[PDB]
Design a protein around this ligand. Structure first.
Ligand SMILES: [Fe+3]
Ligand SMILES: [Fe+3]
Ligand SMILES: [Fe+3]
Ligand SMILES: [Fe+3]
Ligand SMILES: [Fe+3]
Ligand SMILES: [Fe+3]
Ligand SMILES: [Fe+3]
Ligand SMILES: [Fe+3]
Ligand SMILES: [Fe+3]
Ligand SMILES: [Fe+3]
Lengths: 159, 158, 159, 159, 159
C-alpha cells in the first residue's frame, strides 16, 4: 500500500514537472521568435498543470495523503539550439509521463485498486494521443528544417 | 509484443469480415423483398467497418503496425432460406466478434497493456448490447414466423 | 445474360478492392505523419465503398445476382517509400477502375442493355474527374518534393 | 386508533411490494424479449413506489408513525411461462392493492378520520382506472395469443 | 425514320393505356374495400399519364408528329378476384411498359438518334425502380394473404 501512495504522489510532481518543462520550451521559443510553437507549449504547460490538479482532487476524495514536492528547475533549456532539440525533449517528457502512469497503474493493479485503475483509463488514452501528436510534429519539424528558413513557415502558417 | 500485435491485426480483419457478412445479409434480404431487414443489415455493415477504422486509427497512434489482410468472402448466404437463418448467422457472427475482442483483451491483460485495455472497454460494452439486440430480434422473428405471412408485418411495420 | 452479369458482379469487387487500397494509402501516410494526405485517402476509401454499394443496390433492383467475393489484400504498401510512390499507385488504381467501368459498359452495349448503360453514365464522368484530380495532386507532389521538406507544407496547409 | 395506524403501515408495504412485483414482471418480459411489455411494467414499478412515498409523506405530516417493513421477494416469476401468466398476476396484484386501500378507508371511516378519507379519494379513483386498464390489456393478450406469433407482433407495435 | 416516329407515338399510347389500367385497378380495390391499395393505384395512374405528357412534350419540341390513338378499355378487371391477381396484372403491365421503352431505345440506337436516347435514359432507370417496387409489393401481398385476414391488416397500416 505504501508503494501505491508514493507513486500517486510522485505522479502529481511529474505532471507539475512537465508543466514547468513546457513553460521552459515556451520561453526558449519566444526568445527565439517562434511565437507559434511558444503558444502551443504554453497551452500544454497549462494542461499538464490541470492533469496534476485532477490527481490532487482525486487523491483528496480517496484519502490518498498528498504532500507537494519541489518542482525541479527545467534543465533541457540550457542546451537547446534549434526547434528540433526542443521538440525532441518534449517527446521524451511525454514518454516519461506515460511510463509514470503505467507504473502507477501497475501498482494499482497489484493492490486490486479498481477505483484508481478506472480513474487512470482516460489518462492512458490521452497519453497515446499526445505521444502520437508530438511524434508527428517532431517528424514535420525535422523534415522542414532540411531547407533553410522553411521551418519558419510552419510556425507562422500553422500553430 | 508478438501475440498482442498479431491479435490487434486480426481484430481489424474480423471487423471488416463482419462488415461484409452484414452486407451479404442485406443482399439476401433485398433479393427476397425484406427491405426493412435489408436496411438494418446495411446500417450494421457500415458500423462494423467504422469499428475496424477505429482499431486502425488507434493502432497507428500506438505504433502497432497494421497490415491489411484480404477480407474473406461471406459464405453463409448460399445456405440461407428464410429470415430466421440469416438472423441466426448474424447472432453467431456477433458472438465471434465478442470472442475476438475478449481474446485481444486477455492478451493485453497478460502484457499489462493498460492503454489497449482502456481502449477496448466501450467495445466490450457495445458487444453486450449488440448480442442482446440481435438475440431479441431473432426471438421475435422465430415466433412471428410460426404464422404464414405474419413476419412480413415485422419488416413492413418496423 | 452471362458475361454482363459476371462483369457487374466483379465491378463490386473492383470498388471494394479500391476502397481497401485507399485505406492502405491512409495507413502508410498516418504512419509516416502525413495526416492531411491520410485524411484525403480515408475519405476516398469511404467513397469507393459507396460506389460498390451503389452497384449492389442497382443489381438487387435489376435482379442481377450478386455474390460477394474476397476483397484482396492491398500489396503496394510493401514497396511505398515516399508520398509520390503512394499517389502513383493511387493513379494506377483509378485508371484500372476506369477501364473496368468501360469494359462493363462495352458488355452492356453489346447486350443492348440500355438501363445498365444509363446507370454507368455518371460513373464514367466521375472517373474523368477523379483521374484528373489524382493526376494533378501527383504533379504537385512530384514538383514539391524536389526541395527537402517542402512537401511537408502541402500536407499541413492544403489537405 | 391502533388499527388505523396498522393499516396505514400495511398500505406502505403493499405499494412497495407491488413495486417489486412489477419490477419482476419487467425482468421476466425482458429476459424473454418482450421489451415493450417490460417498459410498461418498469414504469408501473416506479409509479407504485411513488404511491408508497405519497403515503409515507402524508403519514409524517399527520404524525402517523411509519415503520418500514420487509419488502418480500416476488415469487410468481418462478412459475410464469407466457405473457398471459404475467398479466394475470399483475391483475391479481392490482386487485390486492384495491383491497388494501378499501380496508384502510373502512378503518378511517370507523374512526371518523375525515382527513385520511379525503387523502384516499384520488387513490380509490386511480385504482378503478388501473384495474380497468390491466383487465383490458389481459383480454387483448389472451385473444391475440390464440394465433402463434401474433402477440409478439403487438408488443413491437403498441407499448 | 418512320419506325422511330411510329414507336414514339406508340409509347404515348402505352403510357395512357397503363394509366387507365391503374385506374381500373384502383376501382377494383375501392369496390372491395382495399382503400390503401386503391390510393396507391390512383397515384400511379396519374404518374403514368405524366409520363405520357412528357413524351408528348418532347415529341412536339423534336418535331415528331403525335397522333393520339384510342386508349383501350382495360379488360383484366373482368377476372381479378383477389388483390394478388391485381398486383400480378400491374407487374405484367410495367414489364410491358419496360419492353416498349426498350423497343423505342433500339430504334433510336439504330437511327443514331442521340437526343432520343438521352431523353429515354431516366425512364429506363425509373422502370428498373418500378419493376422492383411492384415485384416486392406482390411478394408481400402473396405471403400475407396465406393467413385469412392478414392482408387486410396491412392495406390498413402501410399504403
Ligand atoms: Fe500529463
Ligand atoms: Fe502532456
Ligand atoms: Fe464490430
Ligand atoms: Fe457488431
Ligand atoms: Fe469507384
Ligand atoms: Fe475512385
Ligand atoms: Fe398503488
Ligand atoms: Fe398500481
Ligand atoms: Fe410509364
Ligand atoms: Fe409506371
Amino acid at each position: 500500500s505504501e508503494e501505491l501512495l508514493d507513486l500517486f504522489n510522485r505522479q502529481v510532481t511529474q505532471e507539475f514537472t512537465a508543466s514547468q518543462v513546457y513553460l521552459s520550451a515556451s520561453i526558449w521559443f519566444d526568445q527565439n521568435d517562434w511565437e507559434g510553437m511558444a503558444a502551443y507549449m504554453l497551452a500544454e504547460s497549462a494542461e499538464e498543470r490541470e492533469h496534476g490538479l485532477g490527481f490532487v482532487d482525486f487523491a483528496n476524495k480517496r484519502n490518498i495523503p498528498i504532500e507537494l514536492q519541489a518542482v525541479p528547475a527545467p534543465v533541457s533549456c540550457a542546451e537547446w539550439s534549434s526547434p528540433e532539440d526542443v521538440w525532441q525533449s518534449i517527446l521524451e517528457l511525454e514518454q516519461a509521463n506515460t511510463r509514470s502512469l503505467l507504473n502507477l497503474a501497475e501498482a494499482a493493479s497489484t493492490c486490486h485498486d479498481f477505483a484508481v485503475m478506472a480513474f487512470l483509463n482516460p489518462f492512458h488514452l490521452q497519453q497515446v494521443n499526445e505521444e502520437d501528436k508530438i511524434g508527428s510534429i517532431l517528424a514535420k519539424v525535422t523534415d522542414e528544417n532540411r531547407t533553410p528558413g522553411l521551418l519558419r513557415s510552419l510556425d507562422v502558417v500553422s500553430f
